[PDB]
Amino acid sequence: ISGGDAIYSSTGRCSLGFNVRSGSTYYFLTAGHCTDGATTWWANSARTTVLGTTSGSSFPNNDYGIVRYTNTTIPKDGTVGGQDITSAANATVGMAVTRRGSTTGTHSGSVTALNATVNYGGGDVVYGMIRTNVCAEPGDSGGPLYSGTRAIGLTSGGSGNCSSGGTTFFQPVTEALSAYGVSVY
């Protein structure tokens, strides 16, 4: 399993962000609005190949979370599409970025704004977001935003779609890495 692939909770589907480590311990990052209501994660829609258990969730205000792997034998790939991901960086306006997710696959664009505040309604406001002209659709949440070998963000939400175009906002990954004391690979 790799960044951008489907992950399933008891209620629905999101996308894996990045695979991460602290020493010999493996985890993955995803969106906080995905981990908020989900303890166990599975790799398959049948909900029989366990991935692991949520260990941290931050949503709203932020939108990031973390799941520790309990499945010792599943492959935990370190690439996104063919791309190695070995470090994290901050977004900058104009940076070229690619997202992968389990609804729409791989789509690219530019960073168009930093530190955006995004109101999802119902009290769920997120701050500090990267805005982009990349499209996304429901189920893509949590998937990686990258640029070359650098992790940049985790898919949060947006408007539009991948048929006619959209605007998608991402949680910067660096804050999740720091919060959880892990490193992307």
Binding site: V118, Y120, S141, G158
Partner: peptide, 4 residues
């Protein structure tokens, strides 16, 4: 905007 809407969560994905």
């Amino acid at each position: 905007d809407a969560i994905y």
